[PDB]
Amino acid sequence: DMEFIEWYPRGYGVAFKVKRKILEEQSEYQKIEVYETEGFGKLLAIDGTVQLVTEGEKSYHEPLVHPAMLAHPNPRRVLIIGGGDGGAIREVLKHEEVEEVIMVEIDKKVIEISAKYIGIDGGILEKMLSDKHEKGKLIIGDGVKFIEENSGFDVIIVDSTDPVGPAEMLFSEEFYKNAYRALNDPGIYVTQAGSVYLFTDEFLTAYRKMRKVFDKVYYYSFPVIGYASPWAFLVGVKGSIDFMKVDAEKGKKLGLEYYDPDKHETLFQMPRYIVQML
Amino acid sequence: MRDMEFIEWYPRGYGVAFKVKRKILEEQSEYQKIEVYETEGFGKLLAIDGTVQLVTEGEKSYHEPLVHPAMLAHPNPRRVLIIGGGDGGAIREVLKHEEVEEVIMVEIDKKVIEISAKYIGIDGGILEKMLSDKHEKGKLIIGDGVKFIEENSGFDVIIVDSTDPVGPAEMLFSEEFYKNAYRALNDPGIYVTQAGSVYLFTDEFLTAYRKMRKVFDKVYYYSFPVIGYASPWAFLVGVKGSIDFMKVDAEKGKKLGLEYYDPDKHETLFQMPRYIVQML
Numbered sequence A: 001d002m003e004f005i006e007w008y009p010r011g012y013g014v015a016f017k018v019k020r021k022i023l024e025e026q027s028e029y030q031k032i033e034v035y036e037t038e039g040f041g042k043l044l045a046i047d048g049t050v051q052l053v054t055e056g057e058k059s060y061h062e063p064l065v066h067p068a069m070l071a072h073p074n075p076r077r078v079l080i081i082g083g084g085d086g087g088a089i090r091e092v093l094k095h096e097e098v099e100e101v102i103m104v105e106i107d108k109k110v111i112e113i114s115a116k117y118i119g120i121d122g123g124i125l126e127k128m129l130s131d132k133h134e135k136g137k138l139i140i141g142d143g144v145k146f147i148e149e150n151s152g153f154d155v156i157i158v159d160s161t162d163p164v165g166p167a168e169m170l171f172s173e174e175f176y177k178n179a180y181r182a183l184n185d186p187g188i189y190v191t192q193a194g195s196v197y198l199f200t201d202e203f204l205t206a207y208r209k210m211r212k213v214f215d216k217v218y219y220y221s222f223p224v225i226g227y228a229s230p231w232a233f234l235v236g237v238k239g240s241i242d243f244m245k246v247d248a249e250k251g252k253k254l255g256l257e258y259y260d261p262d263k264h265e266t267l268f269q270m271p272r273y274i275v276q277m278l
Numbered sequence B: 001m002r003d004m005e006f007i008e009w010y011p012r013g014y015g016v017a018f019k020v021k022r023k024i025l026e027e028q029s030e031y032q033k034i035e036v037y038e039t040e041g042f043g044k045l046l047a048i049d050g051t052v053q054l055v056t057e058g059e060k061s062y063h064e065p066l067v068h069p070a071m072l073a074h075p076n077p078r079r080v081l082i083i084g085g086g087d088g089g090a091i092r093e094v095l096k097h098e099e100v101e102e103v104i105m106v107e108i109d110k111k112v113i114e115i116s117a118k119y120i121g122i123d124g125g126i127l128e129k130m131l132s133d134k135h136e137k138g139k140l141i142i143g144d145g146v147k148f149i150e151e152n153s154g155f156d157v158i159i160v161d162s163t164d165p166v167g168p169a170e171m172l173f174s175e176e177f178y179k180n181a182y183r184a185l186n187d188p189g190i191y192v193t194q195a196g197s198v199y200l201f202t203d204e205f206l207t208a209y210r211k212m213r214k215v216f217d218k219v220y221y222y223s224f225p226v227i228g229y230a231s232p233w234a235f236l237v238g239v240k241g242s243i244d245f246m247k248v249d250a251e252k253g254k255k256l257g258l259e260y261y262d263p264d265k266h267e268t269l270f271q272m273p274r275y276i277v278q279m280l
């Protein structure tokens, strides 16, 4: 009767009954574990926290990727910071306009373990590790340092494990300034912002820093299976991007299971007390 | 282990856990097991048959969406019926609408009401007054909501805040009952009930949706991140008459000073996983 629990501030806990432990490894950056749960497939755990559960991860990767993609007029060049499990790039590649996607992940072990034991990327990670993927380019490196030197991205998506905590790319206005400069015109930057209820102060702090840097900023939430849902997301745009509208026509073709492009307006649910604190 | 923990396990082996300071109570009533816990960070936790009913710190995330959308969509909710709601959260919210003239609360387990009034106390004195039949608008009745609805009618709004549809409680999600609930409604009138965990009690949701669709003039579904329950939670709405649930009276909503449900962005109240929408 094994049990996996992740505790959050104020003593809230996300728990899963698990069948067996499959793998426990230590990388130069973090502890990586893989469990076979009872009703959610395989769970990827990084330093004791849920990265994803194979039977539910689409509830995270879909709202993280598609909203931004569908709100950009021509998302040809995309940057993903993190995304070691491969889920985000998989969703990104579903968009035909994409010509090139650069993925910068600092921990190679997360990528290899995910490709061999998680397997949600469909072969994208392996094809990328050998540098044989047509559109995807993998760079084992630091995402922050990368956008300091690189530009030309229509869409920037941050999906990181946060090795040194959330602050690295959330409380850094330096970082947001570099991200905005890295975006094409028009461009869109999107990132997960943590738990709506248990990470509220941080969420609000990132929102205000982004507000001064980008041309317009937005927030949204989504019920993510595996996390202390609802989960918050933050968006920052450069130039002509109206995040309140998505090309629903293009959405129908993605075969989404969670995010509903036809009801994009419902993506913005957010407790009133929080909205009032902005 | 170093501390005390409380967990509600749902299907699929998923659990909602709370670190607690200690267990304040456990009373096996005629109908169910009632327990109260002092949590480390969410106030007092009320549980029935092991399922979370509410945490005093965050319960408005349930009672606000359960009550106000329907209340705000109705042109004039003068007479209201609540089935269940022993804790008093629902009636508290209902009484915030000045159009309300009288409310009838039908709860089957009186223990739940007494325990709530003594160890929870989120009802702002309402439960006590009704218990001694002194409330000016609220009237309490200890019985089965399923039977009361067979001989009673004349309600602008009907709020069903029962436990999960598992046992005697199950009948509050049956067609026979929906049919009578429909008949009991004025024209226009609106019915609303909690409908279970969106991701884990999906069948409860889908089953009730179809049953309600067969009975009412129009049916709607919505969800809200309820603190303490598997998140998000589903809600089903049944309408009789011209009421468009997609619209609520925003000006009236302002006077309520809500903390969770936002009537200014009523459209956001309808989030729902695409695959579940596609199963309707």
Ligand SMILES: N=C(N)NCCCCNCCCN
Binding pocket: B008, B051, B052, B053, B054, B085, B086, B087, B089, B090, B161, B162, B163, B164, B194, B229, B230
């Ligand atoms: N599995 C669960 N936790 N279900 C909770 C909903 C049933 C209690 N409704 C009454 C809530 C208090 N108004």
